[PDB]
A paper describes a structure:
The actin capping protein (CP) specifically binds to the barbed end of actin filaments with a high affinity and prevents the addition and loss of the monomers at this dynamic end. CP is a heterodimeric protein composed of α- and β-subunits and the molecule displays a pseudo two-fold symmetry due to the resemblance of the tertiary structures between the two subunits. CP caps the filament with its two independent actin binding sites at the C-terminus of each subunit (“tentacles”). V-1 and CARMIL proteins directly bind to CP and inhibit the filament capping activity of CP.
Since the CP-binding motif of the CARMIL proteins is sufficient for the interaction with CP, peptides derived from this motif were used for the crystallographic studies; mouse CARMIL (residues 985–1005; referred to as CA21), human CD2AP (485–507; CD23), and human CKIP-1 (148–70; CK23) (we collectively refer to these synthetic peptides derived from CARMIL proteins as CARMIL peptides). In addition to their extensive interactions through the CP-binding motif, CD23 and CK23 further associate with the CP “N-stalk” via the C-terminal flanking residues of the motif. In the CP/CD23 complex, CD Phe505 contacts the hydrophobic pocket formed by the CP “N-stalk” residues [CP (β) Ile29, Cys36, and Leu40] and the peptide residues (CD Leu501 and Pro502). The C-terminus of CD23 extends into the region between the CP-L and CP-S domains. Thus, the residues immediately C-terminal to CD23 (i.e., CD Gly508∼) are expected to form additional contacts with the domain boundary residues to stabilize the CP/CD2AP complex. Furthermore, the C-terminal flanking residues of CD23, which greatly contribute to the CP inhibition, cannot reach the nearest surface of the actin filament. We applied this method to the CP/CD23 complex and the CP structure extracted from the complex, and focused on the first lowest modes. Furthermore, we found that the CARMIL peptides alter this intrinsic mode, both in the direction of the rotational axis and the amplitude of the motion. These effects are observed almost exclusively in the twisting motion about the β-subunit axis, yet not about the α-subunit axis, suggesting that the CARMIL peptide suppresses the twisting movement between the CP-L and CP-S domains.
Author numbering:
A (entry chain C): 485 to 507
B (entry chain B): 3 to 244
C (entry chain A): 7 to 276
The structure:
């Protein structure tokens, strides 16, 4: 029940994950 | 389901002295949340060297693509990438201008340190991150570091005469010392604030000025809050324990 | 790409690293992230116990005044802990943080009066110096050497105001007449989390060596050493705070540019 401001910042989709995480 | 909410709650509670390891551990605990976690969990800023122009720039999730980071100076990824996300020509021009502007802002307020600005396109406007990193000189055997992460979303209108701005700013402040009287003391962490405003977009009030004013107002406010929380509230809590 | 074994190792780690007064929230978070109550039960039960002992969790025993600390020194095996002041053992549920089944217990008839004298002196010191402090004093022979181990806990939990704090101190006097070697460690953790996550983590190691005589007089002397060192630590922490604020924080960023006004953004841009 804490407010998470950083969860609703604008995103950039299409970013590849770091290699060690695959995608 | 509630997983992201719990992951973010965890980051608010685990010691920020282990902030980098905490995130790495969380992504291992819930691997399918990796993108969302990299996007929502702030980390200390890292300084890299742009070997093309010879200027320092800052690394975070916002200028990353795969394992490479984009420099705001040379507009290139390091290590090189075939197909890294790049701003449009119009946004890159705004980005160069912002970088120059926030470099003067940085000199004026911080008198040192490193800044970086990264913009990207949205369907109806654009977003940016304004990054500032300043290390203290180590006087009186105190290590100090300040990180600013200002993320702005700008929604542009068909008329081009007004825009909606939403700023979400985190500042991280780290202090550490080891002395005979106190032993080891590490006072560290971050605060995040948000605000939102419609502004006129004009030649007298262009996007960079609108964003600059909001960033300046926010960071001045957070500097004073940090002062209150770090040196007022935590100290009072310590003295309340004994 | 991450195995269950690795996930529960991480779950156990996070549980042990929960800030003072926030064990329940962290546990709830981790439980929902693992989403495997069996894995959590098997691979993370050591972590509940390790948390409580590391944190010197005070616990009320039905029938006895004041509380006792859960510590590594009280751990009797089989879910039981020692209360050395009331001379009892009890079952302790690490998850509910509840004591039960108190039973009379024997310890060390040799170190008996010394432990009691030190306990008596320490309890008065703790009630005088801490708002809601608790202490536990153990007397054991370690590697053949008679040792008094004094543990002190004091916490303030205010989650409605988004903060919690805890002091722990542990003092070991190894009796080598006519002296005693003193080793101690003092620790503080404070967490503020209204719209953020700021923590102080602090610890100080103490080495000293003092004269020993009779049980009551030595107890007085031990408490003076504890008092002097804990006062000096708390004083030095407040001095460090002043220095961090007037020196380091001020050098990291100005309040305003030298013009004593905020920026003219139009003049920046041209
Ligand atoms: Ba998603």
């Amino acid at each position: 029940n804490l407010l998470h401001l950083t969860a609703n910042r604008p995103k950039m989709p299409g970013r590849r994950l770091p290699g060690r995480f695959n995608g | 389901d509630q997983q992201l909410d719990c992951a973010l709650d965890l980051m608010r509670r685990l010691p920020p002295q282990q902030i980098e390891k905490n995130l790495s551990d969380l992504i291992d605990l819930v691997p399918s949340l990796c993108e969302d976690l990299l996007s929502s969990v702030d980390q200390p800023l890292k300084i890299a060297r742009d070997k093309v122009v010879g200027k320092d720039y800052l690394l975070c999730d916002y200028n990353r693509d795969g394992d490479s980071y984009r420099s705001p100076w040379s507009n290139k990824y390091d290590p090189p990438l075939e197909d890294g996300a790049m701003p449009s020509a119009r946004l890159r021009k705004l980005e160069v201008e912002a970088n120059n502007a926030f470099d003067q802002y940085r000199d004026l307020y911080f008198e040192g340190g490193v800044s970086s600005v990264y913009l990207w396109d949205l369907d109806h406007g654009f977003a940016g991150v304004i990054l500032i990193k300043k290390a203290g000189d180590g006087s009186k055997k105190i290590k100090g570091c300040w990180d600013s992460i200002h993320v702005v979303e700008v929604q542009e209108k068909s008329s081009g005469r007004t825009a909606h701005y939403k700023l979400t700013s985190t500042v991280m402040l780290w202090l550490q010392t080891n002395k005979t009287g106190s032993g080891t003391m590490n006072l560290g962490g971050s605060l995040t604030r948000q605000m939102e405003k419609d502004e006129t977009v004009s030649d007298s009030s262009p996007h960079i000025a609108n964003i600059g004013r909001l960033v300046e107002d926010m960071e001045n406010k957070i500097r004073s809050t940090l002062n209150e929380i770090y040196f007022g509230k935590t100290k009072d809590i310590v003295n309340g324990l004994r | 790409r991450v195995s269950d074994e690795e996930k529960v190792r991480i779950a156990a780690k996070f549980i042990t690293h929960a800030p003072p007064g926030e064990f329940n929230e962290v546990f709830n978070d981790v439980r929902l992230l693992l989403n495997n109550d069996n894995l959590l039960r098997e691979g993370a039960a050591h972590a509940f116990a390790q948390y409580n002992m590391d944190q010197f969790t005070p616990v009320k025993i039905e029938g006895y005044d004041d509380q006792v600390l859960i510590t590594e020194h009280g751990d009797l095996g089989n879910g039981r802990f020692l209360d050395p002041r009331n001379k009892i053992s009890f079952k302790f549920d690490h998850l509910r943080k509840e004591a039960s089944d108190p039973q009379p217990e024997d310890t060390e008839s040799a170190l008996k009066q010394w432990r009691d004298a030190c306990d008596s002196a320490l309890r008065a010191y703790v009630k005088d110096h801490y708002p809601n402090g608790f202490c536990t004093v153990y007397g054991k022979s370690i590697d053949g050497q008679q040792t008094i181990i004094a543990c002190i806990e004091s916490h303030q939990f205010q989650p409605k105001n988004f903060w919690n704090g805890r002091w722990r101190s542990e003092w070991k006097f190894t009796i080598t007449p006519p002296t005693a070697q003193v080793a101690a460690v003092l620790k503080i953790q404070v967490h503020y989390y209204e719209d953020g996550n700021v923590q102080l983590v602090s610890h100080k190691d103490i080495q000293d060596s003092v004269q020993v005589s009779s049980d009551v007089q030595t107890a007085k002397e031990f408490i003076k050493i504890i008092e002097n060192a804990e006062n000096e630590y708390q004083t030095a922490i407040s001095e460090n705070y002043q220095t961090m604020s007037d020196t380091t924080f001020k050098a990291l960023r100005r309040q305003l540019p030298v013009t004593r006004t905020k920026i003219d953004w139009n003049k920046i841009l041209s």
